[PDB]
Symmetry: D2
Subunit: 295 residues, 4 copies
């Protein structure tokens, strides 16, 4: 036997950081969950009980906090790049660092119509994420994403013209509910190192904002022929608006809302044009995926 | 042996309803999870295999959908009152109906600064709930609540002057983070029946709004001596603003954010006035409760 | 306004304890999650920012660990009684302690047919719990329970003879699946204090074992007329086997498994006597409850 | 823009199946959650609203049930192979089927020391899984796994000799707790099609059993130098015992149990040799991974 692949580190590292402006009194908070996994010349820790090659996961945890103290934690693409670069530069025998960051929402409260200087609300479990893979000799590969963005439209979704055979029972429809949890990923051009990442820093927040905006507007305005067709429109627009993105990935569940036939009860009409009360289905669910790139 | 208490019914009944304005094109959606449990002269179903006294839970489910089709589902205090009244009036031998409703957020989207007619976002897992107990001969008892409202303030929380003995290690502080998940309940005066509930319908949305507003503003503005002291201020203000409320209950976790001493590393200063990076603690957590009533 | 009720403390306190037998090498582990909430002359902490009456929740946490170090943690009824007694005796102004313990399973592994001295498996998320309410001047009130015991029987469940009216669609059946998650509680006679609890210590593990055994055997052997009827049989037997129990409570979901009619496809027969493939339903679910006491 | 990758289908399809032996009365149950995602000449569903190429996800769901009715559902490697083969053979334009199955435990109950013919218990949330990728022209690729196997050993884990630098605070130890949730995967030699899978059917249950047995015995008996070293031993033994496995993957969290220094309280000794009460840490956690193959 032989080790074919190995990575190790610390997961579920919760981190908070505050910024305090001493002139204005305005405080700003950031909260994330971080995972760092390392690769390198570490196989003898597996095969020969050689712990000398192990940068302890406890030390990886310490390093996350120290790096957050000494550097900005925003945008997460930059923080992850700084963090991963540290491990491959500090340790000769570590050749890759894989950094995953989940950013949690703390939105400033408005109190009597005014932004409060130090109070925040978690307006949803929607996340902003990054996966930053720092590989010695091969730059920095960043995937940015939004996830847990849950939406519903009550009309202007259709599904007809699909294949019909002996396994098919689904009726065609020209007016249905469409609800999903959006998981959208934009994959950046490889960066040569930390200097190139830094050179693009404003584009990370701007591209996240674009991806979110395009998602919401396309979902709301597309009279959808299918989830497939709608998600492709989203991807095409994001690629048109940021040339440093190479691909856009969507993964969308179709969270079904079923009509309820009540005509057995006093002739109640609750289907078709008369449909008002629906049964949300927890499972099963459609799951639709695509990766869109440049033609 | 003998049955001392018994209730049964259908839980986790997911319900969606849409309202469509045919003049304006504007659609409005509601989504809830409903539980209905019945009590009455049902002990022989337990003791003698007498199913004749059982209104089947499947039929209770059907009834929830039928009632949603025939009545408004908002405010949930009214829907729950209609639903519970149905069971005790329809079935001579059923003497109480216990209706729990969890309302899920579907907030209308703004697209290019304009409200969209049929697209919605789940802006958080914060819930609006009701518990409506309809008891024959004893009216309708309603508890309304908000839950899952997650907040954080980065300063203007203190905790000093607590009891100190041989079990105490906690340092006094004059500046800490305070974060919680708000669970707030307002308990209404008993209503004699459905007519009295209907007579107060506008007060249900208005009192929910007040409770939410008071919670947020008091949390943001109170330089908190303790969770105890801050939550009491919230309750007192809600009682002052709605005379048909008899009591207000809060249940608040203290979701700790711990300082991280980094001075072992290059003399880094990250405590006290220099504290910037903190470790959010998943557990344990303080848990603080009170019920406030009229003096 | 005035405080009508108040309790506070530390929740989600995870605790592990090991016992090591230095003669045999055999180690035994216990793991729990503890909550302690206190009541007493504490209202001024809410109304007047008087923290002097607050035994800090951090100190409550410390006390849990200290008490686990100095006392047995098993049976949990005894540990909870020791812990709650400490708070009301130590602090003159604290008059009640409410202790909830969730015990997690660590079952010793058998390796090559032999019990291993120090290795354990979590054989299910089934829990053993206690609620111990220690109230000054009013003894110790204990509720013991098992929860998260998930079972299924594939036949020998029936449901016919229920009420049928214009809200009913459910077909009668003489052979269905029955699956539930058992939540069973046995409520002890009040104990006058810690000495009386200690005097009954062996009965706590023995009654838990009886409750579990009766649950499983009755579920497996009762050709069930209803969940109501089956759960009553369980309760009656537990009360017959431990005179120091005053009541037994069950709360049982009916986790439905629906037949799937496949006759639209090649005349496939999958209902009634031919039913082989079923659709487990995540929601909704029946929910059946009773409390049984002594006649 | 252009579609670079696309797959779609039905997720979270819950399936139950019963086998009834009409001679003996013995019933046997199986429960799974299935996901099927298809790939093929489907890009025009994304780019041109062409639903004619879509085998509806609802039809995929129907097909799962139909296939379970007509074929054995065990071992899951075989069921998944049958299911995936169906889609690529039935639909000329579908060229890959990706089938994920999670198998849920229903272990037969022993009642008064005897196996019951039709009653079962969920003895843990441990799962047995498969990922079966059926690719036209490229056979069938199967990954089998066990997951959610949660274990703890109270001694005979060590961690010393790791790298120590200015980021390190962790003390070396020669006696610690080790607890993990085992996720173990064995990757089979490619199979040319369904006939070859069928030719090996008994090896699927036997290899799962071996993987489980080796995991448990190695965890219990290895005086562990590190998680790395222990997991490698497990993998090497599984590869030695089944030549049709090409690689074994482990992913193991290190679920920390921290000592609690109580010496501030009455000189209580609870560290080192005196350590009895520990604080289980929910987060962060080490995360250790490797893939082991044949040298
Ligand atoms: Na390096
Ligand atoms: Na009645
Ligand atoms: Na006292
Ligand atoms: Na094909």
């Amino acid at each position: 036997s032989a080790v074919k692949a190995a990575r190790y580190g610390k997961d579920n590292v919760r981190v908070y950081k505050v910024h305090k402006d001493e002139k204005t009194g305005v405080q700003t908070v950031y909260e994330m969950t971080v995972c760092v996994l390392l690769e390198g010349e570490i196989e003898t820790s597996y095969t020969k009980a050689d712990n000398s090659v192990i940068v302890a996961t406890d030390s990886i945890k310490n390093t996350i906090y120290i790096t957050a103290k000494q550097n900005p934690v925003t945008p997460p693409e930059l923080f992850g790049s700084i963090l991963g670069t540290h491990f491959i530069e500090k340790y000769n025998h570590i050749h890759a660092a894989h950094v995953n960051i989940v950013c949690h929402r703390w939105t400033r409260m408005d109190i009597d119509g005014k932004p409060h200087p130090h109070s925040f609300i978690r307006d949803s479990e929607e996340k902003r994420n990054v996966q930053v893979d720092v590989v010695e000799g091969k730059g920095i590969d960043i995937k940015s994403s939004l996830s847990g963005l849950t939406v519903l439209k009550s009309t202007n979704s259709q599904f007809w013209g699909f294949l019909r055979d002996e396994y098919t029972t689904l009726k065609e429809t020209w007016d249905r509910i469409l609800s999903t949890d959006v998981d959208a990923t934009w994959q950046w051009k490889n960066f040569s190192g930390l200097q190139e990442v830094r050179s693009h820093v404003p584009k990370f927040d701007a591209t996240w904002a674009t991806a979110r905006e395009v998602t919401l507007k396309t979902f709301a305005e597309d009279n959808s022929a299918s989830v497939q067709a709608t998600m492709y429109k989203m991807a095409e627009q994001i690629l048109a608006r940021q040339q440093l993105i190479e691909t856009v990935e969507y993964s969308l569940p179709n969270k079904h809302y079923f009509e309820i036939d009540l005509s057995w009860h006093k002739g109640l009409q609750n289907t078709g044009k008369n449909a008002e009360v629906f049964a949300p289905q927890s499972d099963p669910n459609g799951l639709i995926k695509c990766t869109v790139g440049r033609s």
